[PDB]
Symmetry: D3
Subunit: 265 residues, 6 copies
């Protein structure tokens, strides 16, 4: 990790003095569900490129931005465009925004992503509530928490078993019903692996048998950092393709808006 | 990745202007399979050391060399000496030759390696056709494609489900009939891990139960990069040992690979 | 790597001239097993920080020292305080002391650690004789032996099938049944992952299915390096907790002291 | 050596595609001489931070921008804020903008800076036309051209003996007379050293003895990179202090002087 | 610079909580002048190797230490063994102790070193009060201040013209009188160059013509950092040799201890 | 410095076992003076690229090779193609061949280079015996000897005042008479700066007043490494241009060939 505590402080100060908004919830839009930014009122945008110490997108001319605004009666900050390990960023860079949010006053992080369905019951287009995750990179030591611990953020050995908020999942369901959805609200374990190439048939089977319902190349690192610093976490995976074992983004967007009401404080 | 597109190009040009040869198939010989380089005729050799941008071998006294020639009717370029992650090379160096091959005009990459047997039915001396792989290093982000995508080679999110060419696997099985050999041509999933130490009993069991048939510390990186830049891929693992679960065939493999040349399209 | 052979030597020569003791066995004490240093006689101590090329502990106020002496009438060298990958150290540093030991003349390495129980039959306070291990980081290439091989220490492809000495596993059991406890001596597979966060449920379940009986974030690197340079190896995990799938340290200590007599040569 | 040729192309292409302006001259504005960005007509700005591969400013709250515009009937590209070796940038990042300017089609580089006066006859407010320079970091190898030469920019061993365009210097003197100035236009050698600290007395005498007239911590790397890739170069120093051997006033003069010289720049 | 402001803080606090002394002045002893460490009563020592963030000596057998004590009613901290660019350390490590001293409450820095005599009138054994310096490495940018400026220590462009305290220079000559010496107290310009080879004849002549009186491979970096962070400064070179242009260590030692009285505060 | 003592040993062994020649003199040809290699009899060439640990040339199409052969009855090892700091090599690479030659048994290094004449009396085509040098990069610490000193090669602070052999210089003047050249054997101080650009007028004047007679971008690092490891050294600059202050190669070839006979043992 090449950031010092003060780097995080400097970026949060710079933001608090360039916007007066004071979000309590942050949201990381996955690939495709980035449209949630529009439909946020009193919008104020910052190019990641101009924020001090912020990682800068790779795809030239596709640089992301941090949008401060009101979603559905709640003050939030959202990431439009994210950083992945396969793009060459170390996790301490990928997850930098999360510790900044915490210092901005945020208390709840909502993560979303487009994933590959491993579970056969999932159909192209469904929404899966993340109840748990499997961190493959972490098994080898690739972890944003690697390095001496920063007490001012969290403890040395952060529990992860309860990473995803119990209450939020219940509410996620309740609020999915009122919507009057015909297709049910899926629920699974998300498995993160490096990328960028997609899985071989042998790997998909192995991951499935490993107990994974969906695969992606993101999110896990953010959640670990979020949980380490004490943020409340909950999030979803938009199954955009089922994996070879041998569009509907809009609904996730509004579903996320409504959810805002369910977040405490 | 510390190579820019032009690096690859400079290397291809240097080779293209230093040899009259114009290979259409590339072969990476596994450990103890370098004998396949003999058998090439009209051969021309280049030490890895003298080639611009080429990684140089680590193992003292094992130079490393690229050999161009005709095998059994087909123009080939061969690697005699391989690079491995356990030697300290990052995958962008291990797989560097592959992209040079593509820029040279190569269209098919043949991979070969010695591996340990996981499948209970496998015997020493068996030849396993690689039908698929499990890239364990890749589960943690160690990947030759990590970093921004170079579109002039291939796409950002390359598919791997069809990595090992289907028409070749069928031609492999049919051609093996003509080998005369008594034992069958095995087939399976090759799992790659880092090494250099061989597996423990719990690891062997664990890998077998994950669906792996053969274990090694190579090949997969090269396959990923080959598929990324559109090369057709087919290969084999010589089972030189049966892993603890609780030579007279390397020549056969060489002759089989020579035979198979005549079965590669165009 | 990062150290050359002469480094390991320089460090060995330094320790050799700074103490006349000539240990035959080395002991790496795990978390909480620090107390094995006391109950060692004619002890001579060296702070990690003053010994050439030795890595220095991260934890503030958690110094780190190498202790030479006599344990149960046996000359050995013990590490009070260890090095983990989650602290920021690459394995070529974590395992640096092991090769130094081989150069000192040590012929047997005893590894100790605190671990999480994955095997349902284990109870907190249990002592699990390490029978085998699963090196998860090793699968992705994180390995203290990565880089050109140093032939003066060992071979290119060392075998790991018989890492934990069969004879000591027999003599460990024969000796345990001479201390009497309502609980028998446990035996099993130690799986190592990076850290520093504790496991999720999905991961905990995953690891049990791999055939793991106990999780940790150390030890495996030292064992691999010890077998590579021909040291005899054996060790124990002290189950300090049971993993969630949906008054015992002093024991190990006297147990480890007893086994000294059972060590060959 | 940290950038590949394509990195410069990418950066140039991204600029050439975000603006239709096509500068013939680039100007690097010295310390506090940035008011000249005004005077520019049809200005189009781009913060350094947003341009691909561009170094980003260190001093918090000093952003830094590249402005394209017309000065006095002449297409220009100007740097508002610059990079210095003393801030931690290696010379290959400090001079990165100069190569991009060449790729944009710029043919002439105008460089200015604030400098400490070493010549005893200089006074605060003097403007010193740069006739030559002494590159001290260069004597130890810290050089923006270190590394394998990129032939597409220039030759391996470029000459520096004629770095500062003679014609432009004569035109600067003609131009200065036409402005009605009383205090003569000084002219001499600029010596660059690393910094960030100001010199000791023994260092100031030593530098004067090396033939230096003014001292600063910038400009020379850019000049060297500019000559290597063929740009014509002209520059001067605003003497803001007399060095110890034992202002904004001279601003709108500098800006008018630079504006006037635009018309004397060939082609 | 690899150190963040807080690294300087952690090192200062540590020293502060490990000793009760509160030095007001610091002394850096040059080659063959570490005897001064003694003469210090109430000596409390710390090996460099054990102080957090401290660089470690290079030459085997010379560990180097930081000693706190009294020199003449004067509470001070001294460096026995210093760091050099020629050894491989970047100037930001060479000068790390100076900023730590400042944070320990030190106000005055005394620097001493051994040097080659360029001034042909100097004689081996002479002591040369340092009046000015020439920082050759600084001409090409090798400077401990390179990098973003840290306001908490000093300004962006610190003056260096009055680096060697004028009053102390006067008290130094005086005090040399009331010490009754047979040789005059020399005073001149110290020029720092990299090393480690000694000068060629052409270099020596060149150096004398730059106005240098004594050449060496240290001190200047330390003085630059001290001045940058507000320390008063003065020092001496002990001319241990005359350079090819075509013993008295105890003295310097007693001279410095005498000067303790004349240091303000 | 990235090389360890054993890399040198490894490289020397590889060479000693790949040729039977055992030269006692090494010659480094200047860029442009590479014709000395032709003229060599019973030559055996090794491309730099195949020699373990050797730096490899950057100029594509100009391989660079080490040639072993007989010059004027004397066995030589010759470098055809040289390494320079301006090409990006650190001095520890530039001078790597020099320490290898010592390990091969070489006792004398003949350095050769093309340079710019500073002395107003020099004329193009002059040959200047190098009598002394000024190492500008060394004034700022860029020095092949930077880092821990390898006592197996030499001392910590090697003397440089007698770098260019006294006896070989007299011999060179005698041999020159025998060549009956219109012009005399010039003699002087070689100054080295980094490059790659050539000097401005102000720089030439300064370099000249520094006491330098010729300017180049090489040689000095090799000479320093040479003397540090006890090699005798002598060299010449071929003045190929008079610097702006406001063929003859065959001659240098014959000259060096004649001197082979005058080199000791
Ligand atoms: C590429 C995409 C994730 N992503 C989408 N589909 C897949 C798939 N089949 N396999 C893997 N390993 N990852 C997949 O990223 C979307 P994100 O930015 O929202 O994480
Ligand atoms: C060492 C050999 C591979 N290789 C051969 N046998 C084994 C085995 N049992 N386990 C592992 N992990 N690797 C094995 O390399 C052969 P290649 O270079 O052709 O891949
Ligand atoms: C933190 C402790 C290991 N350690 C103890 N319990 C656990 C657990 N449940 N999960 C993981 N991943 N590690 C665990 O380390 C102790 P050592 O230093 O003696 O290895
Ligand atoms: C710091 C200022 C230059 N600069 C102005 N005065 C001096 C002085 N006396 N010494 C040194 N070394 N530099 C001086 O920079 C202004 P620029 O950014 O326009 O070059
Ligand atoms: C090597 C010694 C300095 N030092 C002593 N004599 C000389 C000399 N003739 N030339 C150079 N360049 N340095 C010399 O270091 C002493 P310090 O550690 O107190 O600076
Ligand atoms: C470029 C050539 C040296 N070289 C030749 N002439 C000059 C000159 N005027 N200025 C500088 N700085 N260097 C000069 O290299 C020749 P070598 O490799 O034999 O040193
Ligand atoms: Ca930025
Ligand atoms: Ca090579
Ligand atoms: Ca230490
Ligand atoms: Ca940017
Ligand atoms: Ca230390
Ligand atoms: Ca090579």
């Amino acid at each position: 990790n090449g950031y010092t505590y003060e780097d995080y402080q400097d970026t949060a100060k710079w933001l608090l003095s360039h916007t007066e908004q004071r979000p309590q919830v942050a949201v990381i839009c996955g690939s495709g569900l980035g449209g949630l930014v529009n439909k946020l009122t009193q919008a104020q945008t910052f190019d990641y490129s101009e924020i001090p110490n912020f990682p800068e997108s790779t795809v030239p001319g596709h640089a992301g931005r941090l949008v401060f605004g009101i979603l559905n009666g709640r003050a939030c900050v959202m990431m439009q465009g994210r950083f992945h390990m396969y793009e060459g960023y170390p996790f301490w860079k990928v997850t930098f925004p999360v510790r900044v949010f915490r210092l901005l006053g945020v208390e709840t992080l909502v993560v979303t992503n487009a994933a590959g369905g491993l579970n056969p019951n999932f159909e192209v287009g469904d929404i899966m509530l993340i109840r748990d995750h499997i961190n493959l990179p972490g098994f080898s030591g690739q972890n944003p928490l690697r390095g001496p611990n920063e007490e001012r953020f969290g403890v040395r050995f952060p529990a992860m078993s309860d990473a995803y908020d119990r209450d939020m999942r219940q509410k996620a369901h309740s609020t999915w019903k009122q919507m009057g959805e015909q297709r049910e609200l899926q629920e699974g374990t998300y498995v993160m692996l490096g990328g960028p190439n997609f899985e071989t048939v042998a790997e998909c089977r192995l991951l499935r048998n490993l107990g994974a319902d969906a695969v992606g190349m993101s999110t896990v690192p953010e959640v670990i950092v979020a949980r380490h610093c004490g943020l409340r976490v909950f999030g979803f995976s938009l199954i955009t393709n089922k994996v070879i074992m041998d569009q509907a983004a809009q609904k996730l967007e509004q579903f996320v808006s409504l959810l805002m009401a369910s977040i405490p404080v």
